[PDB]
Structures are given as structure tokens and as C-alpha cells.
């Protein structure tokens, strides 16, 4: 896969 | 580049036909989804260059996004509600077939799709 990445930083 | 031209938004030589269902799709369904917190990745075509997705436009044969649907509605591109609904379904399908299950974008798409289906349940007859 070529992930898009996260769309919100989880803290 | 990795990106194609965006989808067409004008339907050549198609006569204008307004309907309550098309007004509902533009002014209720699409409005509700557009304003959702998770709408932004879907408001314009997938940017394969920016996201570094070299195969996106190899894998996805029928690109679709909400911006395109919005313009199509505004231009009276769709003959009926079902044609517009199919474009939404294509948008969601593209996300689910390309991205790994469980990715953020997939969770976002799922949330939007659940809302979409709730709003389509009140489509004018």
C-alpha cells in the first residue's frame, strides 16, 4: 500500500 | 504527473430538467456531507502527486469526488437521482478498494457514507 497517512494526530 | 485532468462536469447537449430529488441531493445531501468534519479529503480529486500515490490512477478507473458531484449537480449533469447516487457510491468504493482497511481515510469515508445513507432514506418520492 501507499498509505495516505493520518488525517488527525493522535494525542 | 501522477494526476489526470478532473472529471467532466457538463453533459453535452443535455436539456435542463429540474426535480425535487436533484434539489434535495444538492441542498440537503451534499451540503450535509460537505460541512462534515471529515469531508475535506473528498472535496476535490485525489491528489496522487501530493500524497505520493503513483498507482492511484492506475487502480482507480473512475475517479470521483464531492467537488465533481457538486459541479455536476449545479450544471444539471444528472438526468435523475440514481445517476447522482451512483457517483457518491463510486467515490466511496474507490476509497475502499484502494486504501488498506482500517486506514484513517477509510474510517472517514465510512462515517460519511453512513450519513449519506441516512440522508438518502429521506429522498423525495
Numbering used by the authors:
A (entry chain B): 1027 to 1037
B (entry chain A): 42 to 166
Please give sentences taken from the publication describing this entry:
Bromo and extra-terminal (BET) proteins provide a recruitment platform initiated by the recognition of acetylated lysines (Kac) by their tandem bromodomains (BRD, Dhalluin et al., 1999, Jacobson et al., 2000, Owen et al., 2000). BETs, like all of the 42 human BRD-containing proteins, contain additional interaction domains that recruit other proteins to the acetylated protein target, forming complex assemblies and contributing to processes such as chromatin remodeling and transcription. Direct targeting of BET-BRDs by small-molecule inhibitors such as the high-affinity and pan-BET specificity thienodiazepine (+)-JQ1 (hereafter referred to as JQ1) enables their displacement from Kac. Multiple decreased interactors harbor sequences that can directly associate with BET-BRDs in canonical or new BRD-mediated structural binding modes, and we propose that the tandem BRDs present in each BET protein may be capable of simultaneously recruiting both a histone and a second interactor.
Based on our earlier work defining the flexible G at the X1 position as a binding preference for histone H4 (Filippakopoulos et al., 2012), we fixed this residue to screen a subset (91) of all 2521 unique K-GX-K motifs found in the human proteome, focusing on nuclear proteins with Kac sites annotated in the PhosphoSitePlus database. Additional peptides carrying a Kac-GX-Kac motif, including those from GATA1, ATRX, POLR2A, and TOP2A, adopted the same histone H4-like structural association with BRD4/BD1. Our structural analysis identified multiple cases of non-histone proteins binding to BRD4 BRDs through histone-like motifs in the same structural template we initially described for H4. Our data therefore suggest that Kac-XX-Kac motifs beyond those found in histones can be recognized by BET BRDs.
